[PDB]
Amino acid sequence: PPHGELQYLGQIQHILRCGVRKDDRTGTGTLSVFGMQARYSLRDEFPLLTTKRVFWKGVLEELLWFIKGSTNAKELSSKGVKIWDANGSRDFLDSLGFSTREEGDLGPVYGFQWRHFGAEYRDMESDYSGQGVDQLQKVIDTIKTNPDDRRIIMCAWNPRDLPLMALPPCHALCQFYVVNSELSCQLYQRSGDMGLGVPFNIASYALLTYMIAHITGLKPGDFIHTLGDAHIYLNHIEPLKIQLQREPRPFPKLRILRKVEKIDDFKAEDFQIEGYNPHPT
Amino acid sequence: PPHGELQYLGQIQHILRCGVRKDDRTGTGTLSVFGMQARYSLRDEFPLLTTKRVFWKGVLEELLWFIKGSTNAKELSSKGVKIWDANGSRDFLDSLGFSTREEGDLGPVYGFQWRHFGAEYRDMESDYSGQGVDQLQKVIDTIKTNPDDRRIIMCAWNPRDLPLMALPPCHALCQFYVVNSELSCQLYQRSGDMGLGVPFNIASYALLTYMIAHITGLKPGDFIHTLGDAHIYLNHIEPLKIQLQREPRPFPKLRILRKVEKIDDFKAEDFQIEGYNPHPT
Numbered sequence A, B: 001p002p003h004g005e006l007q008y009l010g011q012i013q014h015i016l017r018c019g020v021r022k023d024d025r026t027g028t029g030t031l032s033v034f035g036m037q038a039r040y041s042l043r044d045e046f047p048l049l050t051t052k053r054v055f056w057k058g059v060l061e062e063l064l065w066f067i068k069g070s071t072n073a074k075e076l077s078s079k080g081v082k083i084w085d086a087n088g089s090r091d092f093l094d095s096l097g098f099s100t101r102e103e104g105d106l107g108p109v110y111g112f113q114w115r116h117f118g119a120e121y122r123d124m125e126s127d128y129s130g131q132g133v134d135q136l137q138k139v140i141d142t143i144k145t146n147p148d149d150r151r152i153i154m155c156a157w158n159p160r161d162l163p164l165m166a167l168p169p170c171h172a173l174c175q176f177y178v179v180n181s182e183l184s185c186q187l188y189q190r191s192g193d194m195g196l197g198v199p200f201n202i203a204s205y206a207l208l209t210y211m212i213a214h215i216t217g218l219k220p221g222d223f224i225h226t227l228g229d230a231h232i233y234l235n236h237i238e239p240l241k242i243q244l245q246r247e248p249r250p251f252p253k254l255r256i257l258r259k260v261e262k263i264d265d266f267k268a269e270d271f272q273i274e275g276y277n278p279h280p281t
């Protein structure tokens, strides 16, 4: 059995060999292919890429952030993770036409869509309990009562809420599958920077699976990663080629110290990555 | 280059050699695999499976039916296509708790989610003009002014309307990609019947790509079919083994004999499947 990270590196290799130049919103040139898929096993190991360090703290904290349904970047920032603070900037909002929102109000982003889909958004601190659909809980509920179900889906794509979001979601929708008391999850990313995003993303949805598996008495199965626009920045082509020569160190293991029963009851301390020996850069 | 149909056949061979036993809502039973993806070229050919005839008449009519925005099964019925009549009977409706809903009203399904996403659904006779988000037209629009856009998406999965639907959409969402004048599309299908279903879908969406290509002045590129729960029904196991031995016939070529302006003014007469040579059924 070949190391799982080989699929990821292979996808990069494929972008180079078969990709074409495609400009991004800012006009910057990239190399991309449309439609890709990788399967990462979650059995006795976590797919936290080793050919380059992954910002785990960001991964773990941000997820917990989505689970709380938070749409205030400040709440995530106070944890040491600033990856969302940019979009919560005062002047940033004004240019988007949200001069009325306070600093931190990201809009109906991931958190909101996950637990209040369809609800009427307003303030990053309004009451939404009872409003909209709680896809997350519903997904968990379905895993238990009807594991054969083929509708275990959590969609963050809300055409209606798009104009109110700081930026459209990258993770359009994810699906969960149950068979032989094993939990698998496929994720649909409409776009992914193979060098910066994808690795962070793989972790996120792999971690989420572990959680829901743990809460539902199941064993993590596979994490399928489906991409829409798989790209690489043209200027990063050289560094990437160097990375593509690194040999993947065996994947780390994820351990949940205490036992949890509800999803919202997970805390940063509950987890711990062991044996993460990534390459320096 | 090899015959594109091999992608499909290959996936069936895989599902047979690795698909694990799994049941459905009816508890029927089928071999299943979670997470599959196939690429189909749309260049100077149309992926209309040849190792087994496809209900083209049905595909073409059903699509126009979606575009129209119709949610009445009687519409597709009155064409020689009753595939949606079953879920629109006086019995099936009551079964689901829609005594009020009159025969035919399939609820807020594809046509609705495609031209009026979000709009509060009343009934198949209500006027939804100027309501919800016209995803279809918006996609067309973006492809024309900003082809590099990585958000070109058409999502038919609306958690808020799922309960009001005669059945959850098998085609969660689709994303369009444009590069080098070539238009490509990817479909996310949560559940797929390899026997009679996937072949039909591969066609439905390939056609959608061609149509949108024509009105945007782009040439057909690739159609990436991504499956979630890919399965082969236990009984279909035999009928398929024979098909796997049938040599694939060169894919036909769609022909749009007429210059169509907008997506709405399209007709079944406008198309022609040239040299389509299936296999004995």
Ligand SMILES: O=c1ccn([C@H]2C[C@H](O)[C@@H](COP(=O)(O)O)O2)c(=O)[nH]1
Binding pocket: A024, A025, A167, A168, A170, A191, A192, A193, A197, A198, A200, A201, B150, B151
């Ligand atoms: O978790 C993340 C966070 C950010 N991005 C970034 C990488 C791409 O450069 C960017 C593209 O954004 P759009 O141009 O598609 O809006 O998304 C991800 O893919 N995944």
